[PDB]
Swiss-Prot record:
SUBUNIT field: Forms a heterodimer with NS2B. Interacts with NS4B. Interacts with unphosphorylated RNA-directed RNA polymerase NS5; this interaction stimulates RNA-directed RNA polymerase NS5 guanylyltransferase activity. Interacts with non-structural protein 2A. Interacts with host SHFL; this interaction promotes NS3 degradation via a lysosome-dependent pathway. Interacts with host CEP63; this interaction disorganizes the centrosome and inhibits host innate immune response.
Subcellular compartments: Host cytoplasm; Host endoplasmic reticulum membrane
Secretion signal, residue range per the UniProt entry: none
Membrane topology: Peripheral membrane protein
Modified positions (N6-acetyllysine) in chain numbering: K207
Domain Helicase ATP-binding: 1-155
Motif DEAH box, chain ranges: 103-106
Protein name: Serine protease NS3
Parent-protein residues present: 1681 to 2115 of 3419
Amino acid sequence: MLKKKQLTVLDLHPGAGKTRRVLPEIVREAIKKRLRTVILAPTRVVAAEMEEALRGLPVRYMTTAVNVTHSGTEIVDLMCHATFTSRLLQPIRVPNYNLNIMDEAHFTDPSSIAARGYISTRVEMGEAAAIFMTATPPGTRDAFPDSNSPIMDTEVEVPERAWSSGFDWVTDHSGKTVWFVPSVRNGNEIAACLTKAGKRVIQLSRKTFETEFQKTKNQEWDFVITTDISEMGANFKADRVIDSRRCLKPVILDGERVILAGPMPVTHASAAQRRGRIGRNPNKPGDEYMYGGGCAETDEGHAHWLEARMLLDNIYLQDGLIASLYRPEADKVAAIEGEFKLRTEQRKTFVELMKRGDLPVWLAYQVASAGITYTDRRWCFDGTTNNTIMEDSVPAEVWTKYGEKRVLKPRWMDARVCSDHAALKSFKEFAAGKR
Ligand SMILES: CS(=O)(=O)Cc1nc2ccccc2[nH]1
Protein backbone atom coordinates (compact mmCIF):
# COMPACT_ATOMS: atom_id res chain seq x y z
CA MET A 1 0.00 0.00 0.00
CA LEU A 2 2.94 2.35 0.88
CA LYS A 3 4.21 2.94 -2.78
CA LYS A 4 4.12 6.41 -4.43
CA LYS A 5 1.04 7.00 -6.67
CA GLN A 6 -0.89 4.24 -4.84
CA LEU A 7 -4.39 5.04 -3.52
CA THR A 8 -5.78 1.94 -1.73
CA VAL A 9 -9.49 1.64 -0.74
CA LEU A 10 -9.45 -0.49 2.40
CA ASP A 11 -13.12 -1.60 1.99
CA LEU A 12 -13.29 -4.43 4.60
CA HIS A 13 -16.93 -4.79 5.83
CA PRO A 14 -18.03 -2.67 8.83
CA GLY A 15 -16.38 -3.89 12.13
CA ALA A 16 -13.82 -6.04 10.14
CA GLY A 17 -11.02 -4.33 12.22
CA LYS A 18 -9.78 -1.60 9.76
CA THR A 19 -9.24 0.86 12.70
CA ARG A 20 -8.17 -1.49 15.61
CA ARG A 21 -6.12 -4.17 13.70
CA VAL A 22 -5.01 -2.90 10.19
CA LEU A 23 -4.28 0.78 11.08
CA PRO A 24 -1.51 0.09 13.70
CA GLU A 25 0.12 -2.40 11.24
CA ILE A 26 0.11 0.37 8.52
CA VAL A 27 1.53 2.93 11.01
CA ARG A 28 4.41 0.65 12.19
CA GLU A 29 5.33 -0.05 8.54
CA ALA A 30 5.18 3.71 7.70
CA ILE A 31 7.49 4.58 10.67
CA LYS A 32 9.94 1.76 9.59
CA LYS A 33 9.97 3.28 6.05
CA ARG A 34 10.39 6.92 7.44
CA LEU A 35 7.16 8.04 5.63
CA ARG A 36 5.85 11.34 7.00
CA THR A 37 2.26 10.17 7.61
CA VAL A 38 -1.07 11.84 8.39
CA ILE A 39 -4.02 9.93 9.94
CA LEU A 40 -7.40 11.70 9.50
CA ALA A 41 -10.21 10.96 12.00
CA PRO A 42 -13.76 12.14 11.15
CA THR A 43 -14.49 13.20 14.80
CA ARG A 44 -12.73 13.85 18.14
CA VAL A 45 -14.50 10.69 19.44
CA VAL A 46 -12.71 8.61 16.74
CA ALA A 47 -9.38 10.49 17.35
CA ALA A 48 -9.56 9.32 21.05
CA GLU A 49 -10.35 5.66 19.98
CA MET A 50 -7.39 5.75 17.55
CA GLU A 51 -5.04 6.80 20.39
CA GLU A 52 -6.09 3.57 22.19
CA ALA A 53 -5.47 1.45 19.00
CA LEU A 54 -2.09 3.19 18.48
CA ARG A 55 -1.02 3.26 22.16
CA GLY A 56 2.80 3.18 22.46
CA LEU A 57 3.39 4.27 18.80
CA PRO A 58 5.14 7.59 18.15
CA VAL A 59 2.13 9.65 16.91
CA ARG A 60 1.59 13.44 17.29
CA TYR A 61 -2.11 14.05 18.24
CA MET A 62 -3.03 17.42 16.70
CA THR A 63 -6.31 17.54 18.71
CA THR A 64 -7.05 18.60 22.36
CA ALA A 65 -9.25 15.39 22.42
CA VAL A 66 -6.13 13.30 23.35
CA ASN A 67 -4.01 13.85 26.48
CA VAL A 68 -0.43 12.64 25.73
CA THR A 69 2.97 14.34 26.27
CA HIS A 70 4.81 13.84 22.91
CA SER A 71 8.57 13.21 22.31
CA GLY A 72 8.63 16.05 19.69
CA THR A 73 10.14 13.37 17.32
CA GLU A 74 6.93 11.91 15.75
CA ILE A 75 6.75 11.60 11.93
CA VAL A 76 3.06 10.44 12.18
CA ASP A 77 0.44 13.16 12.74
CA LEU A 78 -3.20 12.50 13.65
CA MET A 79 -5.87 15.17 13.23
CA CYS A 80 -9.56 15.45 12.28
CA HIS A 81 -10.63 15.61 8.59
CA ALA A 82 -11.84 19.22 9.13
CA THR A 83 -8.55 20.23 10.79
CA PHE A 84 -6.56 19.01 7.77
CA THR A 85 -8.65 21.00 5.29
CA SER A 86 -8.70 24.03 7.66
CA ARG A 87 -4.84 24.07 7.87
CA LEU A 88 -4.57 23.73 4.05
CA LEU A 89 -6.80 26.82 3.64
CA GLN A 90 -4.94 28.93 6.25
CA PRO A 91 -1.54 30.62 5.78
CA ILE A 92 0.06 27.76 7.76
CA ARG A 93 2.64 25.18 6.51
CA VAL A 94 1.11 21.69 6.16
CA PRO A 95 3.78 19.04 5.49
CA ASN A 96 3.60 17.32 2.08
CA TYR A 97 2.71 13.93 3.74
CA ASN A 98 4.19 10.88 1.97
CA LEU A 99 1.31 8.70 3.27
CA ASN A 100 -2.23 10.00 3.77
CA ILE A 101 -4.59 7.77 5.75
CA MET A 102 -8.27 8.76 5.96
CA ASP A 103 -10.42 6.77 8.42
CA GLU A 104 -14.25 6.67 7.89
CA ALA A 105 -13.39 7.96 4.36
CA HIS A 106 -17.08 7.90 3.30
CA PHE A 107 -17.75 11.09 5.37
CA THR A 108 -19.64 13.52 3.08
CA ASP A 109 -19.05 16.78 5.02
CA PRO A 110 -17.51 19.39 2.66
CA SER A 111 -14.11 19.40 4.44
CA SER A 112 -13.86 15.55 4.13
CA ILE A 113 -14.75 15.59 0.39
CA ALA A 114 -12.19 18.41 -0.11
CA ALA A 115 -9.54 16.48 1.85
CA ARG A 116 -10.15 13.42 -0.40
CA GLY A 117 -9.81 15.63 -3.51
CA TYR A 118 -6.55 17.21 -2.35
CA ILE A 119 -5.07 13.82 -1.27
CA SER A 120 -6.18 11.89 -4.39
CA THR A 121 -4.77 14.72 -6.61
CA ARG A 122 -1.37 14.56 -4.82
CA VAL A 123 -1.38 10.76 -5.34
CA GLU A 124 -2.32 11.17 -9.08
CA MET A 125 0.57 13.73 -9.44
CA GLY A 126 2.97 10.93 -8.32
CA GLU A 127 3.88 12.71 -5.03
CA ALA A 128 2.21 10.60 -2.33
CA ALA A 129 0.36 7.44 -1.31
CA ALA A 130 -3.06 7.27 0.34
CA ILE A 131 -5.27 4.76 2.14
CA PHE A 132 -9.04 5.46 2.34
CA MET A 133 -10.55 3.23 5.06
CA THR A 134 -14.31 2.62 4.65
CA ALA A 135 -16.77 -0.27 4.18
CA THR A 136 -18.72 2.03 1.79
CA PRO A 137 -16.65 3.70 -0.96
CA PRO A 138 -18.31 6.40 -3.17
CA GLY A 139 -20.96 4.96 -5.52
CA THR A 140 -21.33 1.70 -3.54
CA ARG A 141 -24.76 0.22 -4.44
CA ASP A 142 -24.81 -2.35 -1.57
CA ALA A 143 -26.90 -1.28 1.48
CA PHE A 144 -26.51 -4.79 3.05
CA PRO A 145 -22.79 -5.61 3.29
CA ASP A 146 -21.32 -8.48 5.32
CA SER A 147 -21.12 -8.14 9.15
CA ASN A 148 -19.28 -9.83 12.07
CA SER A 149 -22.60 -11.57 13.00
CA PRO A 150 -25.81 -12.22 11.07
CA ILE A 151 -28.32 -9.32 10.99
CA MET A 152 -32.15 -9.64 10.86
CA ASP A 153 -33.10 -7.11 8.07
CA THR A 154 -36.80 -6.08 8.00
CA GLU A 155 -38.48 -3.48 5.78
CA VAL A 156 -41.14 -1.84 8.00
CA GLU A 157 -42.95 1.51 8.34
CA VAL A 158 -40.93 3.61 10.79
CA PRO A 159 -42.57 6.55 12.56
CA GLU A 160 -41.20 10.06 11.75
CA ARG A 161 -43.66 11.77 14.15
CA ALA A 162 -45.09 11.12 17.63
CA TRP A 163 -47.39 8.03 17.55
CA SER A 164 -50.17 6.63 19.85
CA SER A 165 -50.71 3.22 18.17
CA GLY A 166 -49.63 0.99 15.28
CA PHE A 167 -45.88 0.75 16.15
CA ASP A 168 -45.88 -1.52 19.25
CA TRP A 169 -42.70 -3.29 17.94
CA VAL A 170 -40.78 -0.03 18.61
CA THR A 171 -41.45 0.14 22.39
CA ASP A 172 -41.97 -3.63 22.98
CA HIS A 173 -38.16 -4.18 22.57
CA SER A 174 -36.11 -4.83 25.78
CA GLY A 175 -32.63 -4.07 24.33
CA LYS A 176 -30.82 -0.96 23.11
CA THR A 177 -31.79 0.77 19.83
CA VAL A 178 -29.94 3.27 17.66
CA TRP A 179 -32.55 5.24 15.63
CA PHE A 180 -31.40 7.31 12.61
CA VAL A 181 -33.63 10.33 11.91
CA PRO A 182 -33.30 12.87 9.09
CA SER A 183 -33.01 16.01 11.28
CA VAL A 184 -32.57 17.30 14.84
CA ARG A 185 -36.19 18.61 14.85
CA ASN A 186 -37.57 15.18 13.78
CA GLY A 187 -35.39 13.43 16.45
CA ASN A 188 -36.73 15.87 19.07
CA GLU A 189 -40.34 14.81 18.41
CA ILE A 190 -39.54 11.04 18.37
CA ALA A 191 -37.38 11.42 21.50
CA ALA A 192 -40.23 13.22 23.35
CA CYS A 193 -42.68 10.42 22.35
CA LEU A 194 -40.27 7.67 23.59
CA THR A 195 -39.59 9.64 26.85
CA LYS A 196 -43.37 9.94 27.43
CA ALA A 197 -43.57 6.08 26.99
CA GLY A 198 -40.94 5.64 29.80
CA LYS A 199 -37.82 5.17 27.62
CA ARG A 200 -34.39 6.68 28.35
CA VAL A 201 -33.32 8.61 25.23
CA ILE A 202 -30.00 10.21 24.25
CA GLN A 203 -30.01 12.56 21.21
CA LEU A 204 -26.88 12.98 18.99
CA SER A 205 -26.29 15.57 16.23
CA ARG A 206 -23.16 17.25 14.77
CA LYS A 207 -23.09 20.16 17.27
CA THR A 208 -23.67 17.95 20.37
CA PHE A 209 -21.84 14.75 19.29
CA GLU A 210 -18.61 14.79 21.42
CA THR A 211 -20.34 15.79 24.69
CA GLU A 212 -23.52 13.72 24.22
CA PHE A 213 -21.80 10.57 22.82
CA GLN A 214 -20.12 10.13 26.28
CA LYS A 215 -23.65 9.69 27.79
CA THR A 216 -23.93 6.41 25.81
CA LYS A 217 -21.05 5.08 27.96
CA ASN A 218 -21.84 6.84 31.29
CA GLN A 219 -25.65 6.35 31.58
CA GLU A 220 -28.19 3.59 30.98
CA TRP A 221 -30.25 4.26 27.85
CA ASP A 222 -32.92 2.47 25.79
CA PHE A 223 -32.68 4.61 22.62
CA VAL A 224 -30.09 6.78 20.91
CA ILE A 225 -31.84 9.18 18.47
CA THR A 226 -29.17 10.33 16.03
CA THR A 227 -28.74 12.14 12.76
CA ASP A 228 -26.40 10.81 10.04
CA ILE A 229 -23.33 11.92 12.11
CA SER A 230 -23.41 8.42 13.75
CA GLU A 231 -22.51 6.95 10.31
CA MET A 232 -18.87 7.99 11.00
CA GLY A 233 -17.50 5.21 13.25
CA ALA A 234 -19.75 5.91 16.33
CA ASN A 235 -19.91 2.55 18.19
CA PHE A 236 -22.79 1.57 20.46
CA LYS A 237 -23.47 -1.53 22.55
CA ALA A 238 -26.82 -1.96 20.74
CA ASP A 239 -28.83 -4.90 19.39
CA ARG A 240 -31.17 -2.91 17.09
CA VAL A 241 -30.99 -0.13 14.52
CA ILE A 242 -34.22 1.60 13.45
CA ASP A 243 -33.45 3.44 10.23
CA SER A 244 -35.90 6.02 8.79
CA ARG A 245 -33.68 5.70 5.64
CA ARG A 246 -34.24 9.47 5.32
CA CYS A 247 -31.93 12.52 5.29
CA LEU A 248 -32.02 16.23 4.43
CA LYS A 249 -30.28 17.33 1.24
CA PRO A 250 -28.90 20.89 1.10
CA VAL A 251 -29.71 22.15 -2.44
CA ILE A 252 -28.51 25.40 -4.02
CA LEU A 253 -31.50 26.94 -5.98
CA ASP A 254 -30.64 29.34 -8.90
CA GLY A 255 -27.10 29.98 -7.47
CA GLU A 256 -28.90 32.29 -4.94
CA ARG A 257 -30.19 30.34 -1.82
CA VAL A 258 -29.75 26.99 -0.04
CA ILE A 259 -32.81 24.93 1.01
CA LEU A 260 -32.87 21.75 3.08
CA ALA A 261 -34.80 19.54 0.67
CA GLY A 262 -36.60 16.35 1.77
CA PRO A 263 -36.50 14.42 3.88
CA MET A 264 -35.57 12.01 1.12
CA PRO A 265 -33.87 8.61 0.75
CA VAL A 266 -30.32 8.05 1.96
CA THR A 267 -27.56 6.73 -0.25
CA HIS A 268 -26.71 3.03 -0.22
CA ALA A 269 -23.44 3.94 1.58
CA SER A 270 -25.35 5.80 4.36
CA ALA A 271 -27.86 2.94 4.72
CA ALA A 272 -25.00 0.40 4.99
CA GLN A 273 -23.21 2.54 7.65
CA ARG A 274 -26.46 2.95 9.62
CA ARG A 275 -27.09 -0.79 9.51
CA GLY A 276 -23.37 -1.34 10.24
CA ARG A 277 -23.83 0.06 13.80
CA ILE A 278 -25.09 -3.50 14.65
CA GLY A 279 -24.06 -7.09 13.76
CA ARG A 280 -20.60 -6.11 15.07
CA ASN A 281 -20.26 -8.78 17.81
CA PRO A 282 -19.65 -12.34 16.44
CA ASN A 283 -20.98 -13.66 19.84
CA LYS A 284 -24.35 -11.80 19.47
CA PRO A 285 -26.10 -12.97 16.27
CA GLY A 286 -29.62 -11.70 15.50
CA ASP A 287 -29.13 -7.97 15.93
CA GLU A 288 -32.06 -6.28 14.12
CA TYR A 289 -32.10 -3.69 11.30
CA MET A 290 -35.56 -2.20 10.73
CA TYR A 291 -35.66 0.13 7.71
CA GLY A 292 -38.46 2.50 6.66
CA GLY A 293 -37.62 3.27 3.01
CA GLY A 294 -35.46 2.63 -0.03
CA CYS A 295 -32.11 4.16 -1.02
CA ALA A 296 -31.36 6.61 -3.86
CA GLU A 297 -28.24 8.56 -4.97
CA THR A 298 -29.31 11.80 -3.15
CA ASP A 299 -25.62 12.94 -3.17
CA GLU A 300 -26.17 13.96 -6.83
CA GLY A 301 -26.55 17.78 -6.77
CA HIS A 302 -26.07 17.82 -2.95
CA ALA A 303 -24.54 21.19 -1.87
CA HIS A 304 -21.67 19.48 0.05
CA TRP A 305 -19.88 18.55 -3.23
CA LEU A 306 -20.19 22.17 -4.56
CA GLU A 307 -18.99 23.43 -1.12
CA ALA A 308 -16.04 21.00 -1.46
CA ARG A 309 -15.17 22.68 -4.80
CA MET A 310 -15.32 26.11 -3.07
CA LEU A 311 -12.76 24.81 -0.52
CA LEU A 312 -10.49 23.12 -3.13
CA ASP A 313 -10.48 26.23 -5.42
CA ASN A 314 -8.97 28.09 -2.40
CA ILE A 315 -6.23 25.58 -1.50
CA TYR A 316 -2.73 26.00 -2.96
CA LEU A 317 -1.51 22.88 -4.76
CA GLN A 318 1.16 23.97 -7.30
CA ASP A 319 1.21 27.37 -9.14
CA GLY A 320 -2.34 27.87 -10.50
CA LEU A 321 -3.29 24.15 -10.47
CA ILE A 322 -6.42 23.17 -8.51
CA ALA A 323 -7.09 19.79 -6.90
CA SER A 324 -9.86 17.70 -8.50
CA LEU A 325 -12.47 15.86 -6.45
CA TYR A 326 -11.72 12.20 -5.87
CA ARG A 327 -12.76 10.60 -9.17
CA PRO A 328 -15.63 8.34 -7.91
CA GLU A 329 -17.44 11.33 -6.35
CA ALA A 330 -16.48 14.02 -8.95
CA ASP A 331 -19.76 13.88 -10.96
CA LYS A 332 -21.92 14.69 -7.86
CA VAL A 333 -21.42 18.42 -8.68
CA ALA A 334 -21.67 20.58 -11.85
CA ALA A 335 -18.90 23.18 -11.29
CA ILE A 336 -16.11 24.85 -13.32
CA GLU A 337 -12.73 23.99 -11.57
CA GLY A 338 -11.37 27.38 -10.35
CA GLU A 339 -14.77 29.24 -10.55
CA PHE A 340 -14.62 29.84 -6.72
CA LYS A 341 -10.94 30.86 -6.53
CA LEU A 342 -10.72 34.08 -4.45
CA ARG A 343 -8.00 36.77 -4.31
CA THR A 344 -5.89 36.74 -1.08
CA GLU A 345 -8.04 39.19 1.02
CA GLN A 346 -11.46 37.71 -0.01
CA ARG A 347 -10.00 34.22 0.69
CA LYS A 348 -9.00 35.33 4.23
CA THR A 349 -12.59 36.62 4.73
CA PHE A 350 -14.02 33.33 3.43
CA VAL A 351 -11.85 31.34 5.86
CA GLU A 352 -12.73 33.53 8.85
CA LEU A 353 -16.49 33.36 8.06
CA MET A 354 -16.22 29.56 8.23
CA LYS A 355 -13.76 29.25 11.18
CA ARG A 356 -14.79 32.06 13.60
CA GLY A 357 -18.13 32.82 11.89
CA ASP A 358 -19.20 29.12 11.89
CA LEU A 359 -21.17 29.82 8.67
CA PRO A 360 -21.85 27.11 6.08
CA VAL A 361 -19.23 27.09 3.28
CA TRP A 362 -21.73 28.24 0.62
CA LEU A 363 -22.89 31.24 2.69
CA ALA A 364 -19.28 32.19 3.70
CA TYR A 365 -18.46 32.19 -0.01
CA GLN A 366 -21.37 34.48 -1.00
CA VAL A 367 -20.34 37.05 1.65
CA ALA A 368 -16.55 36.92 0.96
CA SER A 369 -17.02 37.00 -2.86
CA ALA A 370 -19.31 40.06 -2.47
CA GLY A 371 -16.26 41.95 -1.05
CA ILE A 372 -17.85 42.19 2.49
CA THR A 373 -15.38 42.16 5.40
CA TYR A 374 -15.75 39.61 8.23
CA THR A 375 -17.21 42.08 10.84
CA ASP A 376 -19.64 43.84 8.42
CA ARG A 377 -23.04 42.30 9.28
CA ARG A 378 -25.23 44.70 7.23
CA TRP A 379 -26.01 41.81 4.82
CA CYS A 380 -27.81 39.95 7.69
CA PHE A 381 -30.67 42.50 7.49
CA ASP A 382 -30.99 43.74 3.84
CA GLY A 383 -32.35 40.61 2.06
CA THR A 384 -35.64 40.29 0.11
CA THR A 385 -38.84 39.78 2.17
CA ASN A 386 -38.91 36.01 1.33
CA ASN A 387 -35.46 35.72 3.15
CA THR A 388 -37.07 36.67 6.50
CA ILE A 389 -36.04 34.03 9.11
CA MET A 390 -38.94 32.81 11.32
CA GLU A 391 -38.74 31.83 15.05
CA ASP A 392 -41.94 30.18 16.51
CA SER A 393 -44.11 31.51 13.62
CA VAL A 394 -42.85 35.20 14.05
CA PRO A 395 -39.88 36.92 12.28
CA ALA A 396 -36.62 36.43 14.24
CA GLU A 397 -35.22 39.71 15.62
CA VAL A 398 -31.84 40.74 17.04
CA TRP A 399 -30.26 43.88 18.40
CA THR A 400 -27.61 44.90 15.90
CA LYS A 401 -24.14 45.89 17.04
CA TYR A 402 -25.53 49.51 16.67
CA GLY A 403 -28.19 48.72 19.34
CA GLU A 404 -31.11 48.76 16.81
CA LYS A 405 -33.73 45.93 16.94
CA ARG A 406 -34.00 44.50 13.38
CA VAL A 407 -35.66 41.59 11.63
CA LEU A 408 -33.23 38.91 10.56
CA LYS A 409 -33.44 38.94 6.75
CA PRO A 410 -30.11 37.85 5.25
CA ARG A 411 -29.12 38.89 1.72
CA TRP A 412 -28.27 35.20 1.06
CA MET A 413 -30.60 32.67 2.67
CA ASP A 414 -29.00 29.35 3.69
CA ALA A 415 -31.53 27.07 5.53
CA ARG A 416 -28.69 25.55 7.59
CA VAL A 417 -28.37 28.76 9.66
CA CYS A 418 -31.90 28.15 11.12
CA SER A 419 -32.48 24.35 10.71
CA ASP A 420 -33.03 24.05 14.53
CA HIS A 421 -33.19 26.30 17.66
CA ALA A 422 -29.38 25.97 18.28
CA ALA A 423 -28.48 26.90 14.68
CA LEU A 424 -30.75 30.00 14.73
CA LYS A 425 -29.37 31.02 18.17
CA SER A 426 -25.82 30.89 16.70
CA PHE A 427 -26.84 32.87 13.60
CA LYS A 428 -28.61 35.53 15.73
CA GLU A 429 -25.33 35.92 17.70
CA PHE A 430 -23.45 36.29 14.41
CA ALA A 431 -25.93 38.84 13.00
CA ALA A 432 -25.62 40.85 16.28
CA GLY A 433 -21.78 41.08 15.90
CA LYS A 434 -21.15 38.79 18.92
CA ARG A 435 -18.38 36.81 17.19
C1 LIG B 1 1.37 17.75 22.89
S1 LIG B 1 1.34 18.86 21.64
O1 LIG B 1 2.68 19.19 21.21
O2 LIG B 1 0.43 19.88 22.04
C2 LIG B 1 0.56 18.00 20.29
C3 LIG B 1 0.15 18.89 19.16
N1 LIG B 1 1.00 19.27 18.10
C4 LIG B 1 0.27 20.18 17.34
C5 LIG B 1 0.59 20.90 16.20
C6 LIG B 1 -0.40 21.74 15.72
C7 LIG B 1 -1.68 21.85 16.34
C8 LIG B 1 -1.99 21.14 17.45
C9 LIG B 1 -1.01 20.30 17.95
N2 LIG B 1 -1.08 19.49 19.07
